[PDB]
Amino acid sequence: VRTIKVFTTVDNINLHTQVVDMSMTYGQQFGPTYLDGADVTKIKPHNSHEGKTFYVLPNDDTLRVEAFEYYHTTDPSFLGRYMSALNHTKKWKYPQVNGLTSIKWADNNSYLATALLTLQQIELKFNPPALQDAYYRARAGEAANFCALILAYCNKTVGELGDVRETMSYLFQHANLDSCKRVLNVVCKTCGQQQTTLKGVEAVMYMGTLSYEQFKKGVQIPCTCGKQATKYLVQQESPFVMMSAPPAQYELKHGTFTCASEYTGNYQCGHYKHITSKETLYCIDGALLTKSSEYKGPITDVFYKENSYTTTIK
Ligand SMILES: Cc1ccc(NC(=O)NC(N)=O)cc1C(=O)N[C@H](C)c1cccc2ccccc12
Ligand SMILES: [Cl-]
Ligand SMILES: [Cl-]
Ligand SMILES: [Cl-]
Ligand SMILES: [Zn+2]
Ligand SMILES: [Zn+2]
Ligand SMILES: [Zn+2]
Ligand SMILES: [Zn+2]
């Protein structure tokens, strides 16, 4: 009976000492077992494993509670999906580009690089400690865990084609946007005027126009009476807003937005780049950086700063 000592965890915070039989697989002793993302369930302990930390699927109430406290999910597949993604994201390169942690292109990850760049430029606090901790580590240049968690929380695998707006939508549902409030007014010739209040994610996202200004002035929406009506923003309380539309040629002016998603090619299988407004316009394409004083190109998301806005419309 030869044995080594290892640590098991679900969160990489709470470590549990184990003595493992080197004649039995990790799986026979712990159930599903991972070493920095690699599935070692069907592998026997090696000497070099001595004192290393292994992730294991929770197999008692104590570990299921630790997993809920860290990830805010009880989904038994979550840990396996996180580890599957981490097994690739730990091999990606995360260069600093224009003071931001980017990702060198691999495994169709352009949407993920564009999201990661965006998240470093808007004010957001994540509810699950796993996401908040990884977000801090990503900002400091170590983004492998954050990217793997984003894939797991969005139900996406490495290589799957992803949409930045859909990814941000899922992440915002895991963020504290409770204080965020949007008041809209809908004006119809027939039904008259009606005001509604949105909160959380629905208060910071709009689909239909890239222009925050145009949203303030009013956009043409269908009324249930059949008529076109005008929707406009009455009041916005949020640290940012995200304006999205199907990709179209659009002019980005230095100092009038925070950052934007460029999308080139066909529906689903195209390529994202990230435009950021600094002292001039920077285009971050994974590891690649270009700058220009002007920009016109196919934009699908624009992010803007906000604190408190109240319309002057009567
Ligand atoms: C790249 C990508 C991955 C997954 C999705 N997902 C998707 O369509 N999911 C869905 N309908 O459930 C969309 C895109 C996508 O093409 N998004 C761009 C920004 C896009 C969004 C909306 C309308 C479009 C029309 C033409 C081309 C791209 C368009
Ligand atoms: Cl743990
Ligand atoms: Cl929750
Ligand atoms: Cl949550
Ligand atoms: Zn414990
Ligand atoms: Zn939660
Ligand atoms: Zn890979
Ligand atoms: Zn009406």
Coordinates of C-alpha atoms and ligand atoms in Angstrom, one line a residue:
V1 CA 0.0 0.0 0.0
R2 CA 2.0 3.0 -1.4
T3 CA 0.1 6.4 -1.0
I4 CA 0.7 10.1 -1.6
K5 CA -1.0 13.1 0.1
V6 CA -3.1 15.5 -2.1
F7 CA -5.7 18.3 -1.6
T8 CA -9.2 18.1 -3.0
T9 CA -11.4 21.2 -3.4
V10 CA -14.5 22.5 -5.3
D11 CA -13.5 26.2 -5.0
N12 CA -9.6 26.2 -4.7
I13 CA -10.1 28.1 -1.3
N14 CA -11.2 25.3 1.0
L15 CA -8.5 22.5 0.7
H16 CA -9.2 19.0 2.2
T17 CA -6.2 16.6 2.9
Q18 CA -6.5 13.2 1.3
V19 CA -4.4 10.0 1.3
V20 CA -4.7 8.2 -2.0
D21 CA -3.8 4.6 -3.0
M22 CA -1.4 4.7 -6.0
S23 CA -2.9 1.4 -7.2
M24 CA -6.5 2.9 -7.7
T25 CA -7.6 5.7 -10.1
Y26 CA -8.6 9.1 -8.8
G27 CA -12.2 8.2 -10.0
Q28 CA -12.4 5.0 -7.8
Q29 CA -11.3 7.1 -4.7
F30 CA -13.0 10.6 -5.2
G31 CA -15.3 10.4 -8.3
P32 CA -14.7 12.9 -11.2
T33 CA -11.3 14.5 -10.4
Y34 CA -9.4 17.4 -12.3
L35 CA -5.8 18.8 -12.2
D36 CA -5.7 22.4 -13.5
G37 CA -8.6 21.5 -15.9
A38 CA -7.3 18.1 -17.1
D39 CA -9.7 15.2 -16.4
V40 CA -7.6 12.7 -14.3
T41 CA -10.6 10.5 -13.2
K42 CA -9.3 7.4 -15.0
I43 CA -5.6 8.1 -14.2
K44 CA -3.7 6.6 -11.2
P45 CA -1.7 8.9 -8.8
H46 CA 1.9 9.7 -9.9
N47 CA 4.7 10.7 -7.5
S48 CA 4.8 14.3 -8.9
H49 CA 1.1 14.7 -7.7
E50 CA 2.3 14.8 -4.0
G51 CA 0.8 17.9 -2.3
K52 CA -1.1 19.2 -5.5
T53 CA -4.7 20.5 -5.4
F54 CA -7.4 18.5 -7.4
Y55 CA -10.9 19.7 -8.1
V56 CA -13.6 17.0 -7.4
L57 CA -17.3 17.0 -8.0
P58 CA -19.0 17.6 -4.6
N59 CA -20.0 14.2 -3.0
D60 CA -21.3 15.4 0.4
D61 CA -23.5 18.3 1.7
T62 CA -20.4 20.3 3.0
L63 CA -18.8 20.4 -0.6
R64 CA -22.2 21.1 -2.3
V65 CA -22.7 24.1 0.0
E66 CA -19.0 25.3 -0.6
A67 CA -19.7 25.0 -4.4
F68 CA -22.9 27.0 -4.1
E69 CA -21.1 29.8 -2.0
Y70 CA -18.3 30.0 -4.6
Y71 CA -20.2 29.6 -8.0
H72 CA -23.9 30.4 -7.1
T73 CA -25.1 27.2 -8.9
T74 CA -26.1 23.7 -7.8
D75 CA -25.8 22.5 -11.5
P76 CA -23.9 19.2 -11.1
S77 CA -22.4 19.6 -14.7
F78 CA -21.0 23.1 -14.0
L79 CA -17.7 22.0 -12.5
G80 CA -17.0 19.6 -15.4
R81 CA -17.9 22.3 -18.0
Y82 CA -15.6 24.8 -16.2
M83 CA -12.7 22.3 -16.1
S84 CA -13.2 21.3 -19.8
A85 CA -13.0 25.0 -20.8
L86 CA -10.0 25.7 -18.4
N87 CA -8.1 22.8 -20.0
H88 CA -7.9 25.0 -23.2
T89 CA -8.0 28.6 -21.8
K90 CA -4.9 27.9 -19.6
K91 CA -3.0 27.4 -22.9
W92 CA -4.3 30.7 -24.6
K93 CA -2.0 33.8 -24.5
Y94 CA -3.3 36.9 -22.7
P95 CA -1.1 39.9 -24.0
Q96 CA -1.5 43.4 -22.6
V97 CA -2.7 45.6 -25.5
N98 CA -3.2 49.3 -24.9
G99 CA -3.3 48.7 -21.1
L100 CA -6.1 46.0 -21.4
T101 CA -5.8 42.1 -21.0
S102 CA -6.7 40.7 -24.5
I103 CA -6.5 37.2 -25.9
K104 CA -4.4 36.0 -28.8
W105 CA -6.8 34.4 -31.4
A106 CA -7.4 30.6 -30.7
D107 CA -10.5 28.3 -30.9
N108 CA -12.9 30.9 -32.3
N109 CA -12.4 33.1 -29.2
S110 CA -12.8 36.6 -30.9
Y111 CA -16.2 37.1 -29.1
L112 CA -14.6 36.2 -25.8
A113 CA -11.6 38.6 -26.2
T114 CA -14.1 41.4 -27.2
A115 CA -16.2 40.6 -24.1
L116 CA -13.1 40.5 -21.8
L117 CA -11.8 43.9 -23.2
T118 CA -15.3 45.4 -22.6
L119 CA -15.6 44.1 -19.1
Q120 CA -12.3 45.9 -18.2
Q121 CA -13.9 49.3 -19.3
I122 CA -17.4 49.2 -17.5
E123 CA -18.3 49.2 -13.8
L124 CA -19.7 45.7 -12.8
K125 CA -19.7 43.7 -9.6
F126 CA -20.3 39.9 -10.0
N127 CA -22.5 38.2 -7.4
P128 CA -20.6 34.8 -7.5
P129 CA -17.2 35.0 -5.7
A130 CA -15.7 32.7 -8.4
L131 CA -16.5 35.3 -11.1
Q132 CA -15.5 38.4 -9.0
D133 CA -12.1 36.8 -8.0
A134 CA -11.4 35.7 -11.5
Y135 CA -12.4 39.2 -12.9
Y136 CA -9.8 40.8 -10.6
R137 CA -7.1 38.2 -11.7
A138 CA -8.0 38.8 -15.4
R139 CA -7.6 42.7 -15.0
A140 CA -4.1 42.0 -13.6
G141 CA -3.3 39.8 -16.7
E142 CA -4.2 36.2 -15.6
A143 CA -7.5 35.7 -17.4
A144 CA -7.5 31.9 -18.1
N145 CA -9.9 31.1 -15.2
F146 CA -12.2 34.1 -16.0
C147 CA -12.5 33.0 -19.6
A148 CA -13.3 29.3 -18.6
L149 CA -15.9 30.6 -16.1
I150 CA -17.5 32.9 -18.7
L151 CA -17.8 29.7 -21.0
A152 CA -19.3 27.6 -18.2
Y153 CA -21.8 30.4 -17.0
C154 CA -22.9 31.0 -20.7
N155 CA -23.3 27.2 -21.4
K156 CA -20.7 27.5 -24.3
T157 CA -17.8 25.2 -25.1
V158 CA -14.4 26.2 -26.5
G159 CA -14.6 26.6 -30.3
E160 CA -18.4 27.3 -30.3
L161 CA -19.4 30.4 -32.2
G162 CA -20.5 33.1 -29.7
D163 CA -22.3 36.5 -29.8
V164 CA -20.9 39.4 -27.5
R165 CA -24.4 40.7 -26.7
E166 CA -25.6 37.3 -25.7
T167 CA -22.5 36.7 -23.6
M168 CA -22.8 40.2 -21.8
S169 CA -26.5 39.5 -21.2
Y170 CA -25.7 36.2 -19.4
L171 CA -22.9 37.8 -17.4
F172 CA -25.1 40.8 -16.4
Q173 CA -27.7 38.3 -15.0
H174 CA -24.8 37.3 -12.6
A175 CA -24.0 40.9 -11.7
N176 CA -25.4 43.3 -9.1
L177 CA -27.5 45.6 -11.4
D178 CA -30.3 46.0 -8.8
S179 CA -29.8 49.8 -8.5
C180 CA -30.0 50.1 -12.3
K181 CA -33.3 51.7 -13.3
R182 CA -34.6 52.8 -16.8
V183 CA -37.9 54.8 -17.3
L184 CA -39.3 54.8 -20.9
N185 CA -42.2 56.7 -22.3
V186 CA -44.2 55.2 -25.3
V187 CA -46.2 57.9 -27.2
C188 CA -49.0 56.5 -29.6
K189 CA -51.4 58.8 -31.6
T190 CA -54.3 56.4 -30.5
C191 CA -53.5 54.7 -27.1
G192 CA -51.7 57.9 -25.9
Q193 CA -48.7 58.0 -23.5
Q194 CA -47.5 55.1 -21.3
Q195 CA -44.4 55.0 -18.9
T196 CA -42.7 51.7 -17.8
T197 CA -39.8 51.2 -15.3
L198 CA -37.2 48.5 -16.1
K199 CA -34.5 47.2 -13.5
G200 CA -31.4 45.0 -13.6
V201 CA -30.2 43.8 -17.0
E202 CA -33.2 45.1 -19.0
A203 CA -32.3 48.6 -17.7
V204 CA -28.8 48.6 -19.3
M205 CA -29.3 46.8 -22.6
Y206 CA -31.2 47.8 -25.7
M207 CA -31.5 46.1 -29.1
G208 CA -32.4 48.2 -32.2
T209 CA -30.0 51.2 -32.3
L210 CA -26.3 51.8 -31.5
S211 CA -27.0 55.6 -30.7
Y212 CA -27.6 56.4 -27.0
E213 CA -28.5 60.0 -28.3
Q214 CA -31.2 58.5 -30.7
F215 CA -32.7 56.5 -27.8
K216 CA -33.0 59.8 -25.8
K217 CA -34.8 61.5 -28.8
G218 CA -37.1 58.5 -29.5
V219 CA -37.2 55.4 -31.7
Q220 CA -40.1 54.1 -33.8
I221 CA -41.5 50.8 -32.3
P222 CA -44.8 48.9 -33.0
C223 CA -47.8 49.6 -30.7
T224 CA -50.1 46.6 -30.0
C225 CA -52.9 48.8 -31.6
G226 CA -51.0 48.2 -34.9
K227 CA -49.7 51.8 -35.2
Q228 CA -45.9 52.8 -35.0
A229 CA -45.3 54.6 -31.7
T230 CA -42.3 56.6 -30.2
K231 CA -40.3 55.1 -27.3
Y232 CA -37.8 57.4 -25.6
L233 CA -35.6 57.3 -22.5
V234 CA -37.2 59.4 -19.6
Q235 CA -34.7 58.5 -16.9
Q236 CA -31.5 56.3 -16.7
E237 CA -29.7 55.3 -13.5
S238 CA -26.7 53.0 -14.2
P239 CA -22.9 53.3 -14.6
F240 CA -23.1 52.3 -18.3
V241 CA -25.6 51.4 -21.1
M242 CA -25.1 48.9 -23.9
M243 CA -26.8 49.8 -27.2
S244 CA -26.8 46.9 -29.9
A245 CA -28.2 46.5 -33.4
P246 CA -27.7 44.0 -36.3
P247 CA -24.2 44.9 -37.8
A248 CA -24.2 48.0 -40.1
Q249 CA -21.7 50.6 -41.3
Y250 CA -21.4 53.1 -38.4
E251 CA -19.1 56.1 -37.6
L252 CA -17.5 56.1 -34.2
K253 CA -16.3 59.5 -32.9
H254 CA -13.5 59.8 -30.4
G255 CA -14.8 60.8 -26.9
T256 CA -18.5 60.0 -27.6
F257 CA -18.5 56.3 -26.5
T258 CA -16.4 54.0 -24.2
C259 CA -15.9 51.0 -26.5
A260 CA -17.7 49.0 -29.3
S261 CA -17.9 45.6 -31.0
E262 CA -17.1 45.4 -34.7
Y263 CA -18.5 42.3 -36.4
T264 CA -17.4 41.3 -40.0
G265 CA -18.8 38.4 -42.1
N266 CA -21.9 36.2 -42.2
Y267 CA -24.3 35.6 -39.4
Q268 CA -22.8 33.3 -36.7
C269 CA -19.4 32.5 -38.4
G270 CA -17.9 36.0 -38.7
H271 CA -15.1 37.8 -36.7
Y272 CA -15.3 40.4 -33.9
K273 CA -12.8 43.2 -33.1
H274 CA -13.0 45.7 -30.3
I275 CA -12.9 49.5 -30.8
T276 CA -11.9 51.6 -27.7
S277 CA -12.0 55.5 -27.3
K278 CA -8.8 56.6 -25.6
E279 CA -6.7 59.8 -26.6
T280 CA -7.5 58.4 -30.1
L281 CA -9.4 55.3 -31.5
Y282 CA -7.7 51.9 -31.0
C283 CA -8.8 48.7 -32.7
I284 CA -7.9 45.6 -30.6
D285 CA -8.0 42.4 -32.8
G286 CA -6.8 39.7 -30.3
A287 CA -3.0 40.3 -30.0
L288 CA -3.2 42.9 -32.9
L289 CA -3.5 46.7 -32.3
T290 CA -4.2 49.5 -34.9
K291 CA -5.1 53.1 -34.2
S292 CA -6.8 55.9 -36.2
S293 CA -8.3 59.3 -35.5
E294 CA -11.5 58.2 -37.3
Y295 CA -13.5 55.0 -37.7
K296 CA -16.3 53.8 -40.0
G297 CA -17.1 50.1 -40.0
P298 CA -19.6 47.4 -39.1
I299 CA -20.6 47.9 -35.4
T300 CA -23.1 45.8 -33.5
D301 CA -22.6 46.9 -29.9
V302 CA -21.7 50.4 -28.4
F303 CA -21.0 50.9 -24.6
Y304 CA -21.5 54.4 -23.1
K305 CA -20.9 55.8 -19.6
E306 CA -23.8 57.0 -17.4
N307 CA -24.5 57.9 -13.8
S308 CA -28.0 59.7 -13.7
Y309 CA -29.8 61.0 -16.8
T310 CA -33.3 62.8 -16.7
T311 CA -34.8 63.9 -20.1
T312 CA -35.9 67.6 -20.7
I313 CA -38.9 66.3 -22.9
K314 CA -42.3 67.5 -21.5
Ligands
LIG1 C1 -21.5 35.4 -34.0 C2 -22.8 34.9 -33.4 C3 -22.8 33.8 -32.6 C4 -24.0 33.3 -32.1 C5 -25.2 34.0 -32.3 N1 -26.3 33.4 -31.8 C6 -27.5 33.3 -32.2 O1 -27.9 33.8 -33.2 N2 -28.2 32.7 -31.2 C7 -29.5 32.5 -31.2 N3 -30.3 33.0 -32.1 O2 -30.0 31.8 -30.3 C8 -25.3 35.1 -33.2 C9 -24.1 35.6 -33.7 C10 -24.0 36.7 -34.7 O3 -23.9 36.6 -35.9 N4 -24.1 38.0 -34.1 C11 -24.1 39.2 -34.9 C12 -23.5 40.4 -34.1 C13 -25.4 39.4 -35.5 C14 -26.5 39.7 -34.6 C15 -27.8 40.0 -35.0 C16 -28.1 40.0 -36.4 C17 -27.1 39.7 -37.3 C18 -27.5 39.7 -38.7 C19 -26.5 39.5 -39.7 C20 -25.2 39.2 -39.3 C21 -24.8 39.2 -37.9 C22 -25.7 39.4 -36.9
CL2 CL -13.7 23.3 -1.6
CL3 CL -28.0 32.7 -7.6
CL4 CL -25.6 34.9 -9.3
ZN5 ZN -14.6 21.9 3.2
ZN6 ZN -26.1 34.5 -7.2
ZN7 ZN -8.1 24.5 -27.5
ZN8 ZN -51.6 52.4 -29.6

